[PDB]
Design a protein around this ligand. Structure first.
Ligand code: ZXM
Ligand code: ZN
Ligand code: ZN
Ligand code: ZN
Ligand code: ZN
Ligand code: ZN
Ligand code: ZN
Ligand code: ZN
Ligand code: ZN
Ligand code: ZN
Ligand code: ZN
Ligand code: ZN
Length: 349
């Protein structure tokens, strides 16, 4: 493959610097998938990474949850300007009478935190958490990146379609997108393809179920499946409702600096500087409340991490280019962004 030198040149330094046990990289260009696989999925077995290896993609899950939400809209089961409580009887009476589904989706409901408090470890406690939550900001005025926010969005979109979220994803949406090895619950027959994550102390680890984990950060997938999702986000899919769903995930709702927030995907004018891409993926944007501003060739991306795992996806529909990078080390986001940026610049020519 004459792309191998270019990918290796950006990826090998990451592997060495962060002692990354394994990484699966997939690149799209001119309709063609290219797979570059490094290292091991499992340091005990020494099993090689391939484009079939399953990794935890963490928050990249949010792009798939967002697509489910968009699908519920397309099917007429909900609208982004629905009040959250329209789709959850147990939110009737709360501030979620006056927060919208779109606001949940785009982390703009008013300061829902990054994570549930540790004590919120059950259905009952989760419902009470949301019912007792006090808005920090007016709905729509601040982006506070939030698992409880988009997690609730995903959970209520599923409810709007009268099916459990895991079932909708695994039986309808993901097979619809061409993603047959993408799971919220990895089945027995796929467990042998499931990587272990590696903590900073090199302990093997995998995600634990937390409240709304499935919706907010729970997807396990391969580089091949995630590149098919990228393909679907560029070339489209056969099913028309799905196609229209995907399109909805591309539209800008608001901007923070040079990043534009959509459903799941975060977008930039392309060509995009390394500086701009780093800023919109900065700790500031991830961790703090930032005021929303009016929204924006376009690059779409999403970062994802779990304990022991680090993922990144970026693509540029107008140029037919895309990259997936899945590792079983949670290595720093700036390193993901710089490597992706240099590889995509080489593909774009
Ligand atoms: O919430 C998750 C999954 C988890 C990772 C750690 C605990 S649950 N990931 C999202 C935000 N996050 C990233 C991180 C982190 O890496 O510390 N902690 N939280 B994400 O953006 O991938
Ligand atoms: Zn090489
Ligand atoms: Zn529920
Ligand atoms: Zn299938
Ligand atoms: Zn299969
Ligand atoms: Zn597959
Ligand atoms: Zn589960
Ligand atoms: Zn430590
Ligand atoms: Zn588009
Ligand atoms: Zn919106
Ligand atoms: Zn402010
Ligand atoms: Zn050129």
């Amino acid at each position: 493959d004459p792309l191998r030198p270019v990918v290796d040149a950006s990826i090998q330094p990451l592997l060495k610097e962060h002692r990354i046990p394994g990484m699966a990289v997939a690149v799209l260009k001119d309709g063609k998938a290219h797979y570059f696989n490094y290292g091991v999925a499992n340091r005990e077995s020494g099993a090689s990474v391939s484009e079939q290896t399953l990794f935890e993609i963490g928050s990249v899950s949010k792009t798939l949850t967002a697509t489910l939400g968009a699908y519920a809209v397309v099917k007429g089961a909900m609208q982004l300007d629905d009040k959250a409580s329209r789709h959850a009887p147990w939110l009737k009476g709360s501030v979620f009478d006056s927060i919208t589904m779109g606001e949940l989706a785009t982390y703009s409901a008013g300061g829902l935190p990054l994570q549930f408090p540790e004590e919120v470890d059950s259905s009952e406690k989760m419902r009470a958490y949301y019912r007792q939550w006090a808005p920090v900001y007016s709905p729509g005025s601040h982006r506070q990146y939030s698992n409880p926010s988009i997690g609730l969005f995903g959970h209520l979109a599923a409810s709007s379609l009268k099916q459990p979220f895991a079932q909708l994803m695994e039986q309808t949406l993901l097979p619809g997108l061409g993603m047959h090895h993408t799971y919220v619950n990895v089945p027995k027959q796929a467990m042998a393809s499931y990587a272990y994550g590696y903590s900073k102390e090199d302990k093997p680890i995998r995600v634990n179920p937390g409240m709304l984990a499935d919706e907010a950060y729970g997807i396990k997938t391969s580089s091949a499946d995630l590149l098919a999702f990228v393909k679907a986000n560029i070339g489209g899919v056969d099913d028309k409702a799905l196609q229209q769903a995907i399109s909805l995930t591309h539209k800008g709702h608001y901007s923070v600096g040079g990043m534009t927030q959509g459903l799941g995907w975060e977008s930039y004018a392309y060509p995009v500087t390394e500086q701009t891409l780093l800023a919109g993926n900065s700790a500031k944007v991830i961790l703090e409340a930032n005021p929303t501003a009016a929204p924006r060739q376009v690059l779409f991306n999403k970062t994802g991490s779990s304990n022991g795992f680090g993922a990144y996806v970026a693509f540029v529909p107008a140029r037919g280019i895309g990259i997936v990078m899945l590792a079983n080390r949670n290595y720093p986001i700036p390193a993901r962004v710089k490597a992706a940026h240099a590889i995509l610049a080489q593909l774009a020519g």
